[PDB]
Design an enzyme around this catalytic site. Structure first.
Site: not given
Ligand code: DHE
Ligand code: DHE
Ligand code: HEC
Ligand code: HEC
Ligand SMILES: [Cl-]
Ligand SMILES: [Cl-]
Ligand SMILES: [O-]
Ligand SMILES: [O-]
Lengths: 539, 538
Positions: A43, A46-47, A84, A323, A365
């Site tokens: 996890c 991402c979090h 998610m 990014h 991206h």
């Protein structure tokens, strides 16, 4: 006692508004630690470490306790259509593990350690002093056409000779090197592992060898060198995910000089974010400055190194979730993507301002991007997407093409979503686009190729992994990359650690298989960086 | 696709990520009782996250290492290094001391953050700029007006310099710490320790507020853009909590930018979760704001030429930056790094640290006192809290290079606990208070030096006695001149349930001139003459 009474009055802070965190479900050491292990393995990416890294509501105890055990277990089990993933339905985690995760996120986030100057200096090592290094190249390699390839899971990189197609040297580095960059002198190769360990390589030694190393944090993704005229090999900078900071070191010995925290206010809500991870970094050619991307706060910082003792930084607001990105054809405008915002920010390095925010597809991206001159629209920069199979073409000539500057002038359609890298070269008439994370095997194992002289025609699918003749495994293809003369494009067949991988080379002039690089040492090959093209930003 | 892209394990090792506790259990009422005492008696020095004082931080890693009995003993007896004794003195009971020892072994509770949503919510434009007068609609002598702080009353009073009468009382934030003037001389700015700012228009029939806003939970400084062509363009303020500073519209006070000060220290170059913002001064050499960052000992040069894309120059000085002021030429910022016993010199023109000067124990200059020494040339002086010395520092690199940034000489006052030193271009006297000196008589009086004969010992002016107020500590604080420079005002800061006053002295004769008494003059502290504040006359 005078100074004691001087600082004796009560704080203006109201004790009733200072809150003690708790009300979370009890769990033993064994339970808490099991959940924590799963969190960082599945996890955290991402979090984030402090759980405020993804879109939507944070996983902090103020929100998670509001939701409750049942809501949390249900959400983790089935996931949501907004990014998610489902952990219960897929069978990834058990209901016992899910119940633990729901309890875990209702507690205060456990803190990883900080990483200051003392830690950095302790990790700093000068393997070969500048005085003991060669005064000229001691080998007869064609350094410019050398390729720095990442041997991800093996914690190494391999130097591959462009023309001979053979591994010249394998070097031990930090774990899973993310990118490789070249110094302005063309003599030093810099690599940084995802563990924040940087290694400096002297391409001039008899056999290219490491001359310095250092660790700048716990987790990182980027490293860069000073490219402004008169500053060759002067400074090296690196961005860390944790702690949220970036450090500047001596370009010749990697000696830590300055460490700057990126914890701060967001561009959108102008609220405090405790974990703004540093993403892409690019060196300015217009001023002696480093252009650093701050993800979560969506800030682009221009760090002037003309005087690193008294650091001057210009903070430009862009858009949340910055990014990757790269220069335009003229090397003045930094085209970076705010993927989760589905936009591409344009940074004017000369005027030092945000030129625009361009609306594109779902989760852009670009990587470093692909520049070429469109017949109709003039100079453009392009990017593929993870969220869809579109390719955005943006005008980048304000001076002689004001009608198309910073506008999504047109689109192209590739094989599908899951795309990572788009590519071309000044001497080429081809545009390559991969599909590494596309859920379809065949698409993820091939690349689409467009004809720049006939953009209306559909792309041609090149069976890259098939040409490799490797056997079993996912065999995902990724990041197309040209050679020095750009008459051949290289691809990586990123197969399992226990499987067989390869580098596939295609003749750019004919679109035909030219060579396949295989070696028992070529483990999990990912990023590949041609020395000349990386150093001179040829894309 | 994106779920598999961001799906690999974090490089962070789970085994090194630590869960906090091992602390002594305490009920909600016990925790709250201890927490209340902490912010009332300990927060000032140690801070919210308890890493604000010298020595070891009161974080659970150190406190649990020390243990319950070590902690109780230290809190009870204190130390000779700045830590007061709470048990011996009888301030706290042994039951309370035990509660405190247990409390500091727990993770520090967190006060809320305060960003743009909270700021815009607190923001109020009382009188739109278009609805404001175009001329001074009163007969007041604005430049010789004094802005006096009525601390505990959460107000300020505008006192007429020549008539000695309270012209108006205005409701403000709690315990205003300083008053500041806009470059135009029209607007008065005040900020409470509670971080509430109030903009007052001195041109209105009656001086009244036109706007206000809250920029944090705790603050101490506010300033206005003073670079030529930026009159009333921007207004900046620094907060204690959260560790940040914000820039707003110098005309409406509308929040524009907010920047966090959380970062690495200058000495150890390690992360400090609470670097508080101290003194702030507007540069005259470049359109920028000079902000002081205590704990991290950093001086930021915040350029407002382009408020959209903020450019900041970070200059490392020395830990625990606090107050300071300009030299006679208004080019060099002389600020004190009190707990380091040094004064930093920041060249606002060349934008670099000119030097670090070693002074006395805990320097506390305020804005300082500039005068030309008969031998060493132009100097900048400061008194101290830690001792009775007064440092004279050369500030003329051009004509006196041999004395530039050196503790050229030293004077000796009544003793420690001094807060402010003062002089004026037209004056030949140098006044220094001693507000926090443990001796009643010394704290109730000030010392005065003869700048025409520095070798002679100071004279003692019985300020509190001259006020004829009766009971109360009657601590005297911060001398301040009138626009003319022939009067020097002092505050007799007595308890809120006692009688206070402002004493005015004839600088030419050193004789009592007037005493300001009024039932509304409650706990008077800082006094700021409009002209001298606006033009940095000190
Ligand atoms: C911030 C960042 C950059 C820009 C650096 C620069 O140019 O200054 C970058 C570039 C890159 C580049 C640059 C290519 C180029 O041509 O410029 C490569 C090869 C690359 C290989 C991968 N990246 Fe990357 N990447 C991340 C971060 C970044 N990647 C992540 O956090 C993420 C989403 C998750 C992770 O686990 O790291 C991620 C996944 C990947 C992969 O899956 C790859 C293929 C393999 C791996 O080891 O993770 N990243
Ligand atoms: C950061 C700071 C400044 C500089 C602001 C600038 O120039 O922009 C300042 C200035 C000041 C000035 C400026 C005077 C000047 O002539 O410039 C005054 C009057 C003043 C009255 C007090 N100060 Fe002050 N003061 C603090 C902080 C500061 N004080 C504290 O945190 C401290 C040590 C503890 C506290 O409880 O606040 C503290 C105690 C005091 C007092 O006890 C005073 C006498 C009354 C009070 O309300 O706290 N401080
Ligand atoms: C400033 C006037 C202070 C106030 C008010 C309080 N403390 Fe303090 N404390 C202060 C200093 C400068 C120091 C370091 C002194 C030294 O000799 O090193 C301390 C230290 C402590 C400690 C011990 C830290 C350690 O070595 O482990 C404790 C436990 C402590 N202080 C607690 C504390 C409490 C609970 C207070 C309010 C009731 C308190 N301090 C007030 C400065 C000041
Ligand atoms: C990125 C590829 C993710 C990974 C891996 C995990 N989560 Fe996630 N999560 C992510 C997003 C983009 C969102 C927002 C979804 C939305 O519809 O808004 C979330 C959300 C959650 C939530 C719910 C938060 C709330 O609304 O209250 C929870 C409880 C959550 N995620 C938990 C969680 C756990 C425990 C994971 C690993 C086992 C995990 N997430 C992985 C993105 C991603
Ligand atoms: Cl910030
Ligand atoms: Cl910092
Ligand atoms: O990436
Ligand atoms: O003060």
């Amino acid at each position: 006692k005078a100074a004691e009474q001087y600082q004796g009055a009560a704080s203006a802070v109201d004790p009733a508004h200072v809150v003690r965190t708790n009300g979370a479900p009890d769990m033993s050491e064994s339970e808490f630690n099991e959940a924590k292990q799963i969190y960082f393995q599945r996890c955290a990416g991402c979090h984030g470490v402090l759980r405020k890294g993804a879109t939507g509501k944070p996983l902090t105890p103020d929100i998670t306790q509001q939701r409750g055990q049942q809501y949390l277990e249900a959400l983790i089990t089935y996931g949501t259509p907004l990014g998610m993933p489902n952990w219960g339905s897929s069978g990834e985690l058990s209901k016992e593990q899910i119940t633990l995760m729901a309890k875990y996120i209702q507690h205060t986030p456990p803190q990883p350690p900080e990483w200051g100057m003392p830690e950095m200096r302790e990790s700093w090592k000068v393997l070969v002093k500048p005085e003991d290094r060669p005064k000229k190249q001691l080998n007869d390699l064609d350094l410019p056409n050398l390729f720095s390839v990442t041997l991800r899971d093996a914690g190494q990189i391999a130097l591959v000779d462009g023309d001979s197609k053979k591994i010249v040297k394998v070097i031990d580095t930090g774990y899973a090197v993310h990118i490789s960059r070249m110094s302005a002198s063309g003599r030093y190769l810099l690599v940084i592992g995802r563990d924040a360990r940087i290694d400096m390589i002297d391409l001039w030694a008899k056999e290219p060898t490491k001359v310095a190393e250092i660790k700048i944090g716990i987790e990182a993704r980027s490293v860069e060198s000073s490219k402004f005229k008169g500053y060759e090999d002067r400074y090296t900078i690196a961005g860390a995910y944790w702690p949220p900071q970036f450090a500047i070191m001596d370009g010749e010995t990697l000696e830590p000089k300055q460490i700057v925290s990126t914890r701060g206010m967001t561009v959108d809500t102008q609220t405090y974010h405790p974990e703004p991870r540093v993403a892409a970094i690019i060196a300015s050619h217009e001023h002696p400055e480093f252009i650093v991307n701050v993800k979560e706060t969506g800030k682009v910082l221009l760090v002037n190194y003309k005087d690193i003792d008294n650091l001057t930084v210009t903070s430009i607001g862009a858009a949340p979730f910055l990014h990757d990105g790269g220069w335009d054809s003229s090397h003045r405008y930094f085209m970076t993507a705010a993927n989760n915002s589905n936009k591409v920010a344009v940074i004017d390095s000369k005027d030092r301002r945000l030129s625009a925010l361009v609306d594109v597809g779902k989760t852009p991206h670009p990587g470093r991007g692909a520049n070429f001159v469109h017949p109709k629209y003039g100079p453009v920069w392009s990017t593929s997407h993870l969220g869809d199979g579109s390719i955005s073409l943006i005008g980048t000539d304000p001076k002689n093409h004001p009608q198309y500057a910073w506008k999504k002038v047109a689109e192209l359609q590739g094989q599908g979503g899951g795309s990572l890298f788009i590519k071309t070269h000044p001497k080429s008439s081809h545009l390559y686009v991969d599909t590494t994370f596309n859920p379809d095997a065949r698409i993820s194992q091939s690349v689409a190729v467009f004809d720049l002289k006939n953009l209306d025609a559909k792309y041609q699918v090149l069976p890259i992994a098939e040409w490799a003749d490797l056997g079993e495994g996912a065999k995902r293809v990724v990041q197309p990359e040209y050679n020095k003369r750009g008459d051949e494009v290289w691809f990586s067949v990123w197969n399992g650690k226990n499987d067989s991988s390869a580098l596939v080379v295609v003749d750019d002039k004919t679109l035909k298989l030219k060579a396949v690089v295989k070696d028992p040492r070529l483990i999990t090959p990912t990023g590949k960086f041609n020395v000349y093209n990386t150093q001179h930003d040829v894309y």
